[PDB]
Structures are given as C-alpha cells and as structure tokens.
Design a protein around this ligand. Sequence first.
Ligand SMILES: Cc1cc2nc3c(=O)[nH]c(=O)nc-3n(C[C@H](O)[C@H](O)[C@H](O)COP(=O)(O)OP(=O)(O)OC[C@H]3O[C@@H](n4cnc5c(N)ncnc54)[C@H](O)[C@@H]3O)c2cc1C
Ligand SMILES: CC1(C)c2[nH]c3ccccc3c2C[C@@]23CN4CCC[C@]4(C[C@@H]12)C(=O)N3
Ligand SMILES: CC1(C)c2[nH]c3ccccc3c2C[C@@]23CN4CCC[C@]4(C[C@@H]12)C(=O)N3
Ligand SMILES: [Cl-]
Ligand SMILES: [Zn+2]
Length: 664
Amino acid sequence: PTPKYTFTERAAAGNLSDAEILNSNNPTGSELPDESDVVVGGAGIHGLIYALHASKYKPNNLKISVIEKNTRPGYKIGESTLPIFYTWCKLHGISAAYLLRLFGLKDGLSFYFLDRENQGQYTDFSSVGAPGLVLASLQIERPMSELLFTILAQRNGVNVYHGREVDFKSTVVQGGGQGNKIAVSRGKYDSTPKTIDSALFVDATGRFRQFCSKKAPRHRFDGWNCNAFWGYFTAPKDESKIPFDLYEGDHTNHLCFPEGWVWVIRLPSWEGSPIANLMDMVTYILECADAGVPGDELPSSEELARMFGLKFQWVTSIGFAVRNDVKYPEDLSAYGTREAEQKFNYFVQKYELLQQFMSNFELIENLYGPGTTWFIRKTLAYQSPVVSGPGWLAIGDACGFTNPLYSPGINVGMSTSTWAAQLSHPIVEIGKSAPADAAESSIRKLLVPYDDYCKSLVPALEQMNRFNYVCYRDTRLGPQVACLWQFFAGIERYLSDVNIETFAHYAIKWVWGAMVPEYQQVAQKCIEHIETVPLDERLPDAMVDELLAFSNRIKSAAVAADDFSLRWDAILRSFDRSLNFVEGKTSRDIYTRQCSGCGAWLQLRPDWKKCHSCGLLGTEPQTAVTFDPPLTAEEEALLYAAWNTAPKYDPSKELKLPTPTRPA
Ligand SMILES: Cc1cc2nc3c(=O)[nH]c(=O)nc-3n(C[C@H](O)[C@H](O)[C@H](O)COP(=O)(O)OP(=O)(O)OC[C@H]3O[C@@H](n4cnc5c(N)ncnc54)[C@H](O)[C@@H]3O)c2cc1C
Ligand SMILES: CC1(C)c2[nH]c3ccccc3c2C[C@@]23CN4CCC[C@]4(C[C@@H]12)C(=O)N3
Ligand SMILES: CC1(C)c2[nH]c3ccccc3c2C[C@@]23CN4CCC[C@]4(C[C@@H]12)C(=O)N3
Ligand SMILES: [Cl-]
Ligand SMILES: [Zn+2]
C-alpha cells in the first residue's frame, strides 16, 4: 500500500483545527447526529474499547457516537498493558508487528524490593513475557492509543467527536425506549448546544464520574489510601549501569519498599507531531494490517516519522505510588518548587538504590505541554456505588479504581467495558420491542449481574493492592508471598482460546486472580498481621517467618490442584517447576533483545530480522528464542501453533477459566 497524506492535506487546505480534522473522519459526518442508539460520554481508552467491542461483537446494529471534550486525544497516565489487552487488539485485527510501530515492547514484569533498614540490600522477582510468535504486551502512550482506537472506530462505523462536551446539567437520561436527550456543547461558554436523541448513555468519563456521581456519593475504602507523583525521563540505550542485577528495560519494573513502590516503563513518545499527520500515519498502519504486510517489509517507527512528518523519541515513565499515611518534613523547599517535584526528589534520596537508579535518567521538561514536567494525584482508590440505571450504565474508571500496581485500570477495567459493550445490543433492542415499564424491568434484571460484578470487583482489587503493599515491607514477603500468589492466581490460563464472542465472559472471570480463594486467604493473613506494625518500624523477623511458612503451606496444595501445564521454572527466574523458591536460580527463557543501533527492545522471531523501531538489520542468527529448559523442534512447533489464530466461536464449548483448577 502506497502511503497517502489525506488528512495532512485536508487540514492544510481548509486551515482546520485539531478537532475539525479528527471529526472529518466520521462516517456520519463532522457535525453531530440528531439521533443515535448509544451516546458515550468520554473517549478515553475505555469509551473507545467499549465502542469498538460493541460494533465488532454485532456489526451494523447500533448507532454509536462517542463525545470527547479534548480537542485531540489528550495525555493520560496509565501506560502498561497485559496479554489480555494485546489479545483484544489482535482479535480486533491488529497484531504485534503493527502495534510495535506505535508502542513499546513489554516482556513481562520485574520487581526489586529495597531493604529500608539495610540501605543497599535488595531482592528481586522477575518474570518474562512470551515468544514473538506467541503474543506481546505493550507500553502505550495514551494520546497515541486513543488516536489509534478513534481511527479504528471511525473505520468501523462509529462516530467520535473531539472538542465536544456532554452538558450534565441539561442532559436528560430516562428508561423508556429512546428517552435520552444528550446535550452536547463545545463548553460552558457555548450558546449553540446540540441534543442527540438516544436510547442508552454510557458514562465513560473516568474518575470524574460525571454522570454516576449524581446517583451515589463516591465511596472510599477503610484504612490508608495512596498518592502518586511522577514525571518523564530519557531512556538510556546502555542500561548496564542500572544498579539492579539483570535489569531489563522491556519489563514493567517495580522498585518496592515499605512506603510504596516506583514504576518504570520504557515507551516511545510521539509528542510534537501534528494531529493530521498522525491520522495519516495511523491510517496507513491499519491499511498495512488490512493488507497483511509482513513485519520486515513494514516501515520502522522512525521511518514512519520521516514519511509523515512526525516527532519520535524514547522516554521512560517513572512514578511513585505511596501510602498516604507517610510522614513528610514540613519544609521540602530544598527539593524543588512544586509539591509533586518536591515529594518525588525527597523520596528518591531516602533510598540509595533509588538515587543510584535515578542517576541513569535525565528529566524531560514539559513533555506534554506546559506544566507537565511533574504530576501529582492524591487519594487514588474509590468506588462508584451505582453503575447502571434506567437509560444508562458506567464503565472503566467511572465504576471505580484502586492503584497502578499490576495495571488493573486498563486490563481489568476492560472487563466492564467489553461486557457493557456486549450487553448494549439487547438493552437497546428491549427498549425498541416492549412497552416502557416491562422494558425497563427487563433491562434492570439483565444488568443485575453487571451491577454485582462491579460491586464486588473494586473491593477485591483493593484487597489485592493492600496485600502487595504490606508484603513490600519485607524483602522476603514481597517476592515469595505477594508476587508469587499474584502470578499463580492471575496467570491467564487458556487465553489462546478466547475470541470476540467469549472475551467479556473470560475477562470478568480473571480479576488478576484476586477472587481465587487461596489467594484471598493468604492475603488476609498477611494484612491482618502487617497492618498492626506501624509503618516507620521494621517487620519482626518472626512475623516474616510465620507468614512465609503459612503462605508456602497453602501454596503447595493449591499448586498441586492446578491441572494447567506450565513451565513455571522458565517463566519465574527464582522458582522451580512447582513454584518453590530457589535461592540461587537464575535460569529463564529469553524472548527479547536490545537493538545495538537505537536501544529499542525487540522480539526474537525468525521472520523479523530488522529492528521494527529504526530498521537496522541484526545478524541473521540471534532471533532464536532461548528455551531453558529446552524445547524440542516439535514442542516449539506445537507452542506457536496454538497462538496463531483464535478459535472460531463455538456455541457449545464451555469457556475454560483463567484461574487455577479448584480442588476436588
Ligand atoms: C498514577 C497512576 C498510574 C496508573 N498506571 C496504570 C498502568 O500502568 N496501567 C493501567 O492499565 N492503568 C493504570 N492506571 C489507571 C488508568 O490511568 C485508568 O484506569 C484509565 O486511564 C481509565 O481510562 P478511562 O477511559 O476509564 O478514563 P480516562 O482515560 O480518564 O478518560 C475519561 C475521559 O472523559 C472525558 N470527559 C470528562 N468529562 C466529559 C464531558 N462532560 N464530556 C465529554 N467528555 C468528558 C475526559 O476528557 C477524558 O478523556 C494508573 C492510574 C494512576 C492514577
Ligand atoms: C499466559 C501468558 C500470557 C503469560 N501470562 C503471564 C502472567 C505473568 C507472568 C508471566 C505470564 C505469561 C507467560 C506466557 C506463558 N505461556 C506459556 C505458553 C504460552 C505463554 C503465554 C504467556 C507464553 O509463551 N508465555
Ligand atoms: C455460563 C453462562 C450461564 C454464562 N455466564 C456468563 C457470565 C457473564 C456473561 C455471560 C455469561 C454466560 C452466557 C453462557 C455461556 N455458556 C456457553 C455454553 C453454555 C452457556 C451458559 C451461559 C451459554 O449458552 N451462554
Ligand atoms: Cl503491569
Ligand atoms: Zn533499532
């Protein structure tokens, strides 16, 4: 496919604003429709996931308009995604060769637990991702992911309007047929507001809860909450002076300690690029995905930037997520002039390993515009008590949220998004096919499981977060209890069986394993003990012993019960095939390698001989994954065979669950 510069030239020809060039790609037009089946408030990642899944699940059934107040896809924190997300992307027709042009490769998760009372001592827990011929995970710049999903939605009969705001004072939401009158303005100042007559409103306004806040007060969990402060830094080509052994930039890295933890996410940034040019680049990529262009014949990220007149750089996202019962000195003016900056630099110097780590990185000023060198957000976790009602439902952050740790926000939160997408077809048809009272009663009944799932989901995620935090207070509990149980309970068993039809059902059964009983039992034992030790104290060694022995005793039984075959000793660097801790074990599979030219992390797979980021050829060797323990030629062939194409929808297969097998 020859590249076209349609939007770049349209924008220039008409001096189009950012919002106007984007909205000109809508099937129905750049202006709003008079009516629609579904109106989605907010085009963050979840609003777009919802609209894409709803149209893909049953094409040509619902008219869907997404209203987004930003003039173009705006900055968002929340950059790390997991295999279920990539699988969703692949099921929507975008595989790894194309996604990697836009996003950074993610090969698993890694944890380093810093001893507070013995500065310099640390332990680690490291896992891998998957071979390049299996799947990938992604580190995504959210203005790019939300552009990608805007264009893809527009190419699948979904209208998305940037630069338009839902007016929640004049909007009417009712439960009788198409009782909704959604008021859409360009802002408070707008004299000319429009109304979209519609059947169903979806509140996807994230943490702002713009609609469902009118139905219930925000709810907070007992005990401490968290704050976060973060910034953006260079990404070093040479990672070898990072002060942690065997550190790899293509993991989502977690630096953990009693007060909380630090995330480290390497990802490419497109900031500085005109929006019309990016529309042309994304559109070209989708046409190449449509055509099935092989990876080596697809232009590299940097080449795309040259072709479409874009800006491209490598950056590292680095942030603290700490408890809000931490004591700070009254005067922090020595560490900067903004609170976010102050508390960031103050926390770094409290840990020599953090200061040594941070000394590998250079701060970027105002990557996302003025005022964005530093970010702070306080009191992270919350839940919406009411997430549906006559004429409306909520998805994503608007339902609740906990913490960045293990990235439940996108990857678990998309269970609500995709389930709501699937449910939307009968909800709209019910209202079109029955009188008002019975329709409303049948819709209420249909949504009871969605309400119950949401109700119980956030508290389970909150207990998961506290479980990990309290264990982060000791360099044995962190890797050997918290991380071990999260990975055993939450690994995505039978993900290769998921398809568009089963995705929502599978996703709502995952919950990162936080519903698994033996998980919750160990989590409660640890929280009940550690929460009684004041934060500024070290856990007594006897408490660690007792919790470690308890965790391992529950573990051996739960592991035996699991009927899922898994080369555990190849996935977790510190553990054997039965998930026993092994003090000196370092053997593990190797799926990735760093480009000698640009520093970007690459997947090893024989049909990708060039860097997908800069286009430089590696030697014809390499590119061979290292399986340790080894795999035969046949065993490796059978592995990639299962992950090629997703199974067609079989209405009689039962769904196999991601969680471990129950005991007899
Ligand atoms: C510090 C931190 C780190 C995190 N890290 C991760 C991570 O690594 N991985 C992960 O998966 N998750 C992470 N999360 C969670 C993640 O950021 C969110 O779960 C995710 O962005 C939710 O997206 P959303 O679509 O629900 O809402 P958002 O992305 O917030 O989008 C809401 C949209 O609604 C729009 N809007 C609001 N009001 C109106 C109106 N009246 N009319 C029209 N539009 C409107 C806004 O413009 C906005 O675009 C993190 C969160 C925090 C705080
Ligand atoms: C299930 C999977 C997505 C996964 N989910 C994790 C969660 C936490 C830590 C590690 C993982 C992994 C690594 C896995 C294990 N599977 C072996 C056969 C195919 C696959 C898929 C992949 C693989 O190649 N690597
Ligand atoms: C298990 C089931 C009750 C179920 N539980 C859900 C939870 C959330 C979202 C959807 C579902 C469904 C729909 C299912 C999926 N199963 C496929 C084989 C038989 C069955 C039973 C039924 C079916 O026909 N429809
Ligand atoms: Cl993660
Ligand atoms: Zn390169």
